């Protein structure tokens, strides 16, 4: 008399309550430690409620070999006496033909695909349905608990992120579609996690993050090809291609996408995450705090590069969680650090305080933002002379997306003390001590702009100061080379050789025009300009050296759109682009996209734009999803490709009427 007709999991309402509505309105996605409501329907009216309640139990199971000892199987009754901090179920409302049941799960539940079964006493099991269980940053007792609602929305719910590329002095924000709530991303993430056979550990955010970081780094190494090829559409297509091998591969010039991809996967599983960009990052030193750079007498570099190089920038995934297995006080932001393999989670604080030994990867991360650069001059004779070089600072302008805005947040102070400060002094001395125990007349100043306009012009200055009593015959070599984001030399562009005489104790300023038209060849796309100056005097055996990184600045893509918009109404956005280049823009394509605004994307062809002329193209579209949406516009032409910009708009529901 207790037969079951159907069970409604109320996916829409529960997903709204559990902040998973972006995933689906049909499949039940719930976050652990928080109750969700189901409705059990009976084939016939239920006469006696209490005996029927005594007759029914529920079973949750996850995995292929569920068991209690693995905590992948929980059997619990349906009663008001159930442990609400554990698996439990209680009837809240009851009609003669149905029970509204509130089901809780423990705050440390194993995440993944779960089956819910109902056992009537002296009867065979009945599958009620399936649900997916995720980490819960909204629950105080969860290891991934986030204090702030704004932080939860930014680091877990926002699918429209910003990845900061460029150079420390010229930071370019690229709109990125994390897409963590795309339909198949959760399934892909859980299938990837299934490669780890320690399912009982899946209740631990630290273990899940470590496993997924290692697996994603392995996939990146296997799938990213050696060098449009640079046209990106967010994390989700990359994840699909990496896991299936189908789709457009990513090439090494954009290997930094790994940090974004990880951020997607974590975010889909309920682990708050953010992508952090570190500019001038000393990669490949193996904990050593010295970087050797080698230049020839023209101020240029001959080889592709050393193993230890100062990358123009490096992306990293930070994830939020407690660290129960570490000494107290390391809860909060953790850095995922793969090692060519296995991945380590490093509390950001440990990097700041130089706590080398807390985790294996602390030393490498600390060296990445604390190493010192030594410059060597390579002589044609073969002599490898030491050089008096300008200080090349590492770990600059550590940047991430700000909370509740499209603004850039600098978080450098979380990773490092101010240069020259007492605290930095103490940390550096302690680290130097640990490593030790375990194991001129001319002054040159280089002034350059932070950016060089595409096919444009710039001015650079070299101040040479002679401290000798004798006037000096100086040879000044100036070199402009192309370098990839990861510090790999790309192309020698320009070289200049001045022969100057400096009067004793007299400063002298040489102004030099840095013009694209003088380059021996166009810089490869996504490269930066390494500018070098090398002054050598007579036979002193020592040469002054200065270097700078310059970003290439492309024409600004202005987007003009209303700040607010009404759902289900037309909305116009005008895109303007001024051709500041020296040649016409041909093969002109403009693509528009954005989640909740445009289904997939739309590409249009606009007319060729002569130099000093302006494109002004208007697009009309109807937003259909309420909320803070983003329009992304991408321009391609024969002069430049993948020139992206974005603009946010708040779509409001229609005014209530009859």
From Swiss-Prot:
| Database matches in SMART domains | TGc
What changing residue 142 to Y does, per the record, is: In SPH5; Komatsu
Question: Which PROSITE patterns does the record cross-reference, listed alphabetically?
Answer: TRANSGLUTAMINASES
Q: Known SUPFAM superfamilies for this protein?
A: Cysteine proteinases, E set domains, Transglutaminase, two C-terminal domains
The record's InterPro entries line, in alphabetical order, gives: Ig-like_fold (IPR013783), Ig_E-set (IPR014756), Papain-like_cys_pep_sf (IPR038765), Transglutaminase (IPR050779), Transglutaminase-like (IPR002931), Transglutaminase-like_sf (IPR036985), Transglutaminase_animal (IPR023608), Transglutaminase_AS (IPR013808)
| Additional remark text | The substitution of an Ala for a Cys in the active site may be responsible for the lack of transglutaminase activity of band 4.2.
Protein name per the record = Protein 4.2
